[PDB]
Amino acid sequence: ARKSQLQRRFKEFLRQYRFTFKYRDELKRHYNLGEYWIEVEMEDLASFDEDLADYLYKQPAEHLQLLEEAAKEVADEVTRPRPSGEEVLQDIQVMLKSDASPSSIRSLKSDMMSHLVKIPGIIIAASAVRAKATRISIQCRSCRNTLTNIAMRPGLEGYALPRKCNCPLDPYFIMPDKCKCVDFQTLKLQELPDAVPHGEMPRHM
Amino acid sequence: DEDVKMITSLSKDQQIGEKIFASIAPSIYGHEDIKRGLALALFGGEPKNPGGKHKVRGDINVLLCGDPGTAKSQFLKYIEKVSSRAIFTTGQGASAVGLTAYVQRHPVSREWTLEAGALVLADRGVCLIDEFDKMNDQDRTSIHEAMEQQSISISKAGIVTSLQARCTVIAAANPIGGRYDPSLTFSENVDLTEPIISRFDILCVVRDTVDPVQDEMLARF
Ligand SMILES: Nc1ncnc2c1ncn2[C@@H]1O[C@H](COP(=O)(O)OP(=O)(O)OP(=O)(O)O)[C@@H](O)[C@H]1O
Ligand SMILES: [Mg+2]
Ligand SMILES: [Zn+2]
């Protein structure tokens, strides 16, 4: 309920921030060129409305989804006369940027759980890019019934298939030809040599 | 707060420099020039860089060459004790801290780490080297590039990095034949090459001439 109002506030912020419409034109250009991603500076959000900026610092998971939905709606409203064939409205990724000073990696403790953090470091390993599903469909063994458009959570979180069929127990299987996938990668970060304490081993993330 | 005032009052003393020179290495008898040079190296200078083209360092590297039994290692140990950031290493081998960077899984933590050499760990600090003439090719190349370019370049296991190695190097060594020969030059008496020697600002030569009074005083001490 109130989350819809917050999404509307984000929509108004995106459509109204400026004496030229920075985010509006940036989103239009990115959508036209085919780059479905934007970068948002949180100082601009704080200037427009401090409430949402403060909210983003404590509960990023939900407010990020709300902001993504608002950005998608803004992009849809900006690009009304889209060319024929391109009827499908594609999702948009939102990135964050700020000028705040970073914090040392050694300061990570329990109190920083589920919060937004900024950390400097050096990369030492990068795994290959792989595919992760976002929407999946399943089919039953006996009656061949189908459940479609199951939403998957972001991050390193799995999914549990249902055990009851609305037939033997656990009859569901995943169909590979009807899924949407995105790219993901894993990296290794090491503490900066200039900040490691003397006579102590570095730490990783 | 009062420490600053005490330091300023001490600086007003007319013989502060002599006191500082005599303070270094209380347990080592003699070798006043060595202590003075070590004090000069410890205090250091000031780097300069007109624009971003001409870099001039301000570190004073020190090399000591001497006969066996002249207590060269005691000076290094004392410097390691005094210095806030000092890394001690030996060129013979089996050193606690290596002199070359490498990427490996740590035996204790069992984690994939990039361990830099002693030169990088001693950034803005002091690096002490014992048995300077026993080093291999890799250590010599690393020291040469850390003394000339003041940086270390690593290209290993898909990792390409450049790391700063701003440090002051103090090294100890022995002559080729086991005894210094005054008839020959310093370069001919050491296994090191001329470009490596040229990097050091201060070179000290220690001999073991038989002076009965000095020997008696040393034995008494
Ligand atoms: N001036 C001195 N005052 C006090 N002790 C001394 C002095 N000169 C030498 N010694 C003693 O000589 C001994 C020889 O050991 P030391 O480690 O100091 O030798 P070194 O000069 O490093 O020799 P090496 O060439 O074998 O590496 C030490 O126990 C040290 O106390
Ligand atoms: Mg020794
Ligand atoms: Zn079924």
**Resolution in units of Å:** 3.2
Query: Are B113 and A204 an interchain contact pair (Cβ–Cβ within 8 Å)?
Result: yes
Between strands A93-97 and A122-126, the pairing is: unpaired
Locate tokens 């347990």: which residue? B27
Interface A:B, Cβ pairs < 8 A:
26
The dihedrals phi and psi of B161, each to the nearest 5 degrees, come to -140, 155
The token pair at A1 is 């309920």
Residue A159 C-alpha to ligand 3 middle, in angstroms?
A: 19
Answer whether A194 touches B (CB < 8 Å).
Answer: yes
Closest CA to A14 of A44, A59, A35: A44
Q: Which of B35, B70, B209, B221 is the best mutation target for the ligand 1 pocket, counting ligand atoms within 8 Å of the beta carbon and taking the most?
A: B70
The token pair at B24 is 């270094």
- Calpha distance A10→A71 (Å, rounded): 8
Tell me which amino acid residue A170 is.
D
Closest CA to B127 of B153, B101, B98: B98
- Calpha distance A12→A6 (Å, rounded): 10
Query: Using CA positions, which residue lies closest to atom 31 of ligand 1?
Result: B71
- Beta-bridged to residue A173, according to DSSP, are A139
DSSP letter, residue B186: T
Query: Are B113 and A125 an interchain contact pair (Cβ–Cβ within 8 Å)?
Result: no
Classify residue B197 as exposed, middle or buried by CB count within 10 Å of its CB (0-12, 13-18, 19+).
middle
B-contacting residues of A 76-105, CB under 8 Å? none
Closest residue of chain A to B106, computed from CA coordinates? A201
Q: Can you state the angle between helices A22-33 and A60-78, rounded to 10 degrees? A: 80
Whether residue B177 contacts residue B67, with contact meaning beta carbons closer than 8 Å, is answered with no
DSSP letter, residue B48: B
The token pair at B214 is 């000095």
- Beta-bridged to residue A96, according to DSSP, are A40
- Experimental technique: cryo-EM
The token pair at A110 is 């329990």
Whether residue B127 contacts residue B171, with contact meaning beta carbons closer than 8 Å, is answered with no
The token pair at A107 is 């300061």
- Distances A16 to A2, A29, A62, A113 between C-alpha atoms, Å: 21, 17, 22, 34
Residue B200 C-alpha to ligand 1 middle, in angstroms?
A: 23
Region label for A152, one of left (φ > 0), alpha (ψ between -120 and 50) or beta (otherwise): beta
Locate tokens 């089996």: which residue? B94
Q: Is the dihedral of CA A116, A122, A124, A126 positive or negative?
A: positive
Closest residue of chain A to B122, computed from CA coordinates? A198
Identify the three-state secondary structure at position A166: coil
Tell me which amino acid residue B34 is.
I
Whether residue B214 contacts residue B30, with contact meaning beta carbons closer than 8 Å, is answered with yes
Q: Can you state the angle between helices A60-78 and A50-58, rounded to 10 degrees? A: 130
- 3-state SS, B69-131, equals CCCHHHHHHHHHHHCCCEEEEECCCCCCCCCCCEEEECCCCCCEEEECCHHHHCCCEEEEEEC
Which residues from chain A sit within 8 angstroms of residue B103, using beta carbons? 124
